[PDB]
Symmetry: C2
Subunit: 284 residues, 2 copies
């Protein structure tokens, strides 16, 4: 993995970057984004910088200096592209800094795309529904839970995936306590339904806004597909024509098995993968 700080330093081999009292490690107190490097450029940089800006505000962090973030992104991207034509996993790390420090910690990291990602794009995954512990109205009633902020505090997110993995499941769909579909621990849920229309849970739910899904909605609408934000329940996933877990690095992963029920493949599954591909280069 390559590291470029916002200062402009490109980090030494094997050398540590963060002090032992950084709020990122001691408290997970920060925000982050993940981007896909494909064909010489990071995808949807501006839209991801906006969501990083939104997460930092919800976290009472200083407003991100976008020219400096763009330079670290550029430098890190080109260092990756120079070494390989392979795709790149680009992440932005933005923590509150050190305990008592006066400056946030900020750097850019590019790493290889995991082998799990290629299988998820090609074969899809099997998923189970798990209770989130939050009601669907929780986002409105409890803004202090900052459920819309993409923070560095992902311990539960990985714990949920480890739980599902032990049961033979490759991913998870979170369901609210009152039975509404929310999101995945690392993805946005999108559904295909017949009048073919695309549907995703509303963003006032205690969920993260999906940058890649939003771009998919614009490209799909332009190609004639209706797209909307709707309250979905577990029955809507089972009666759907397709379920995808949409994210920035893992672009689209169709759910071929949900709670043990094998799901049929449908013609839209072929065109769905081409819509996301056109969406993540829609800014070029």
């Amino acid at each position: 993995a390559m590291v470029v700080t916002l200062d402009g330093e490109i980090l030494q081999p094997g050398m540590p970057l963060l002090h032992a009292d950084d709020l990122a490690a001691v408290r997970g107190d920060g925000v982050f984004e993940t981007l896909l490097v494909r064909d010489g450029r990071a995808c949807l940089v501006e839209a991801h910088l906006q969501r990083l800006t939104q997460s930092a505000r919800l976290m009472d962090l200083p407003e991100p200096d976008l020219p400096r973030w763009r330079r670290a992104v550029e430098v890190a991207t080109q260092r990756w592209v120079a070494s390989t034509a392979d795709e790149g996993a680009l992440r932005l790390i933005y923590s509150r800094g050190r305990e008592g420090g006066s400056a946030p910690t900020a750097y850019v990291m590019v790493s290889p795309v995991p082998a799990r990602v290629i299988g998820a794009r090609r074969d899809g995954v099997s998923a189970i529904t798990l209770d989130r512990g939050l009601p669907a109205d929780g986002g409105d009633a409890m803004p202090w839970l900052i459920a819309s902020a993409k923070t560095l505090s992902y311990a539960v997110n990985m714990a949920v995936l480890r739980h599902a993995a032990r049961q033979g499941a490759g991913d998870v769909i979170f369901v609210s306590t009152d039975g509404y579909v929310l999101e995945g621990p690392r993805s946005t849920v999108v559904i295909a339904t017949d009048g073919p229309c695309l549907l995703t849970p509303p963003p006032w739910y205690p969920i993260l806004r999906g940058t890649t899904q939003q771009a998919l909605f614009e490209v799909a609408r332009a190609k004639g597909y209706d797209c909307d934000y709707r309250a979905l329940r577990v029955a809507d996933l089972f009666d759907s024509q397709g379920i995808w877990l949409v994210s920035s690095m893992t672009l689209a992963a169709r759910v071929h098995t949900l709670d043990g029920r094998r799901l049929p493949r449908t013609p839209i599954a072929e065109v769905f993968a081409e819509l996301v591909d056109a969406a993540i280069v829609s800014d070029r």
Copy 2:
């Protein structure tokens, strides 16, 4: 700012960075930690805190902590701290999953000064507000994937909750479940004094809450003095009818709640004797 002791026993250079940029503690908050108070030459309740760190590591699928190495690093950090100053010390154990693709967890001990907020909370108490947590009282048993009983490094929401309360002029928060049962604090355990006579009470521990090392030790000392102690389902009404409410944690030992949701709460003689009960609890193992 702070002394760092690795589990080998090596004491870090003062200004040198420790963690790689791809450590799962920073990239994912993926680890567990504990907090101990260094007081009068020794860290308080070391074994009981190592026991809970072992339990948090189990729930987080982390390798079982090597307790002999942890015990030695604690001492080394303790001895260097007491040698440098007679002040109290805030000692933390950090146990992360390691680096991305790494094969060994990252583990170190950190001792830092005690924040100025602690002395005011011990002496003057705090004002707190009740906030809905969004979890039902049955959440701990039914939903283990939420790992609510693990004390993890993913504290972003906890700090955001206090920032919200701070903007409301409140110094701390008491979480309430969706069905109206008192749960816990973002950084503390809730204990109340009530008559059956004077009895100390804490929310039921099968709840989706963190079990308190300091609260459990308080129960042992309080039971010895003849006080009744039990785990009971409490509601917001029980806090207002109580003779005292304290936020109990390992570094800030006891912070009485003198104001809850704007309503000033009466002070009762047990608040003074409570402050010496916790004091006796954190040295009850010596």
